[PDB]
């Protein structure tokens, strides 16, 4: 038999950690229904931020707030299903997912997104910061939401999610307004870029686009982009702000 040599030679520059993205979700259930399904159901996530004002949560004996780890980061949780971002897929492998309890709703298929709880958010930024500091390849655009990786079969973490706040806190990507505007103007005057340029520019940001984009799809896409970066409205409707935002990110957060 033969024991392994962990001390003689260690690689330094040419290597990274496996995890790249941090993805965000709303459970869509009350806590108990959420621990159950993320611990024994058919999915899971690495971390779970409860909504402290949840009867089930308090019932379970929690004063809260807490953050719960359901799967250590080393391992692979199931939250991202069929995915894609930044030229990848099956992001379950390569990401860390966070689930926050928030009973957003699909009602065939009108939607309803409750505001999050503050503590819940202060927790989140706290956690999310702890991750980012530990994965160096988790650049700002890689802090994403299911909706972005799973367009438009998913819509968490939903437009009630204070990204910009998180940006402000160092977490995830956001545009310099100046640069946004510079595009808005340019677009209003010089008109708008062909779909071609757009899709592509959407791709570059990260979005996993199919070969061929029905406007039907497009909607889903814009929608998603919007609930993230322009949640003031997320009608799948090609705007100039919306489009300006895009290039404003692609300017600041480029290849």
């Amino acid at each position: 038999m033969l024991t392994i040599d962990y001390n003689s030679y260690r690689t330094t520059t040419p290597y990274g950690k496996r995890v790249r993205f941090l993805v965000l979700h709303y459970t869509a259930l009350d806590f108990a229904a959420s621990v159950k399904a993320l611990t024994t159901g058919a999915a899971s996530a690495h971390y779970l931020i409860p909504a402290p004002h949840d009867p089930s949560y308090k019932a379970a004996g929690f004063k809260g707030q807490r953050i719960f780890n359901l799967v250590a980061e080393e391992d692979r949780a199931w939250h991202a299903g069929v995915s894609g971002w930044a030229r990848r897929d099956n992001l379950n492998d390569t990401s860390i997912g966070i689930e926050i309890v928030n009973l957003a709703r699909d009602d065939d298929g009108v939607f309803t997104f409750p505001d999050y709880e503050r503590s819940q958010i202060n927790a989140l930024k706290q956690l999310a910061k702890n991750i980012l500091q530990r994965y160096p390849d988790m650049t700002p655009k890689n802090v994403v939401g299911h909706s972005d990786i799973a367009v438009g079969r998913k819509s968490d973490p939903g437009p009630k999610l204070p990204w910009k706040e998180l940006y402000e806190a160092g977490i995830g990507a956001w545009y310099d307004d100046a640069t946004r505007d510079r595009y808005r103007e340019g677009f209003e005057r010089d008109g708008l870029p062909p779909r071609a340029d757009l899709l592509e520019a959407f791709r570059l940001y990260g979005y996993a686009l199919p070969a061929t984009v029905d406007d039907a799809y497009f909607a889903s896409l814009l929608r998603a982009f919007q609930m993230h970066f322009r949640p003031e409205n997320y009608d799948g409707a090609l705007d100039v702000e919306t489009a300006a935002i895009l290039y404003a990110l692609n300017e600041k957060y480029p290849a």
Binding site: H25, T27, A37, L38, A42, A43, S44, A45, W78, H79, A80, G81, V82, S83, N90, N92, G97, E99, H146
Partner: peptide
């Protein structure tokens, strides 16, 4: 949330 949701393997693949």
């Amino acid at each position: 949330a949701x393997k693949x």
